[PDB]
Amino acid sequence: TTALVCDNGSGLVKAGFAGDDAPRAVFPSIVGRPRHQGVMVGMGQKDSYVGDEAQSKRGILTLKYPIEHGIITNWDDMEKIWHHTFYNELRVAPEEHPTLLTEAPLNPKANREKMTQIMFETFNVPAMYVAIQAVLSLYASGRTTGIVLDSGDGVTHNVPIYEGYALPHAIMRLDLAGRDLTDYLMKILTERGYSFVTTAEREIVRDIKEKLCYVALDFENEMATAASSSSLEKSYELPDGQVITIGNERFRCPETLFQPSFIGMESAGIHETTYNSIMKCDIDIRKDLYANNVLSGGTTMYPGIADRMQKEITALAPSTMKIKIIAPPERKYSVWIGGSILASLSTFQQMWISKQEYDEAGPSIVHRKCF
């Protein structure tokens, strides 16, 4: 049998069988209950529309994500999402398939502890393994060295790896991610008159962000240019018409990644925290990390980030070293590709956390040698 590489993530659950190249099912991780009463009877009314159903009938629902920033804060909703994924999207009984869950680094222990408890008690999987989302991203690229910035939708984490030896003291984690960019875009869209408040309209704002926004190679020059001419004014259509025009808000939304002073965050941007983490490592491996900087995660898929980040790092980095940014076109599904690669290796088959070990040693087995 083959194992299920399930990467719940935060924002888009991606699932598929091991040994494949693309996930079988990708769907938003939202749980939306109705808020009105409902008068028609016999309509086959459900009490909680989850998965991709909540994106089609979002008008009469209150969409509520179960994962805020990497950690899980609504256990029942996440359990419902796992149930829907296993039984309704793939139609495979979990009792005869191992699972490979993914977790952001530096998360509280309770998250992985409860994840293992749920996986072994409710779903009754044979054996489950928890992996960090950056080593998998490095696995997918086919390389074995480099510093990967896996800017997901709930958290942005930057992990360096050299010759397969992880450096636990050089990991940089920031809570600025795609969700905060969506919120900031929704906030700055109020300056032109467009007012979005309802949680269902955040999906419309996110679609606008995906289809329109881009990262300028230079912020000040582009903002000075666009504030005079009208070459950047792009039009977009809402799900009911009412065509809207976006001007200099087009590149102010994703510039928050490199300049977090906009939303009040103290920390530096993703262009400087990467270099700062590089400076934390040993002095003899900085050249390889310079030459093998890897981009991954959905939030790093904006058009024009592989040039802005490279320019900023080259400005910061010493003149002699050569800066290279490896950004494969399929960055969004990189984590699941790495997971599928990992699950298909024969050497890895001995690292599954078997049920007997959990029964003998309790839920804390994940923290021990069985990573």
Ligand X SMILES: Nc1ncnc2c1ncn2[C@@H]1O[C@H](COP(=O)(O)OP(=O)(O)O)[C@@H](O)[C@H]1O
Contacting ligand X within 122-161 (CB under 6 A) = 152-154
171 binds ligand X (CB under 6 A): no
102 binds another protein (CB under 8 A): no
- Count of residues that interact with another protein, criterion CB under 8 A: 20
341 binds another protein (CB under 8 A): yes
**Do the Cβ atoms of 366 and 352 come closer than 8 Å?**
no
For ligand X, the closer CB: 113 or 207: 207
Applying CB under 8 A, the residues found at the interface with a second copy are: 106-110, 167-170, 175, 187, 190-193, 195, 197-200, 263-267
For Mg ion, the closer CB: 9 or 98: 9
Question: What single DSSP character describes residue 168?
Answer: T
Q: Which residues pair with 50 in a beta bridge?
A: 31
For a second copy, the closer CB: 50 or 170: 170
**Do the Cβ atoms of 281 and 170 come closer than 8 Å?**
yes
For another protein, the closer CB: 130 or 181: 130
Integer-rounded Cα Rg, in Å, for the chain is: 22
- The total number of residues written for the chain in this structure: 371
246 binds another protein (CB under 8 A): no
For ligand X, the closer CB: 84 or 286: 84
First to last CA, the chain: 23
CA separation for the pair 83, 212 (Å, rounded): 34
> In terms of C-beta density within 10 A (0-12 exposed, 13-18 middle, 19 or more buried), how is residue 185 classed?
buried
CA separation for the pair 273, 300 (Å, rounded): 15
Residue of the chain from 212, 244, 285, 301 that contacts ligand X (CB under 6 A)? 301
For the CB of residue 222, give the shortest distance to another protein in the complex, in Å. Answer: 16
What is the DSSP code string of 49-100?
EEGGGGGTSGGGEEEE-SBSSSSBS-HHHHHHHHHHIIIIIS---GGG--EE
Question: Could you tell which of Mg ion, another protein, a second copy, none binds residue 152, using a CB distance below 5 to 8 A set by kind?
Answer: Mg ion
CA separation for the pair 175, 185 (Å, rounded): 17
Backbone angles phi, psi at 318, to 5 degrees: -60, 150
Residue of the chain from 35, 347, 356, 360 that contacts another protein (CB under 8 A)? 347
Question: Could you tell which of ligand X, Mg ion, a second copy, none binds residue 263, using a CB distance below 5 to 8 A set by kind?
Answer: a second copy
For a second copy, the closer CB: 197 or 243: 197
11 binds ligand X (CB under 6 A): yes
Name residues whose C-beta falls within 8 Å of residue 195's C-beta, 6 or more positions apart in sequence: none
329 binds another protein (CB under 8 A): yes
Residue of the chain from 299, 305, 308, 342 that contacts ligand X (CB under 6 A)? 299
Contacting another protein within 307-326 (CB under 8 A) = 322, 324
The contact set with Mg ion (CB under 5 A) reads 9, 133, 152, 335
The contact set with ligand X (CB under 6 A) reads 9-12, 152-154, 178, 182, 206, 209-210, 297-299, 301-302, 332
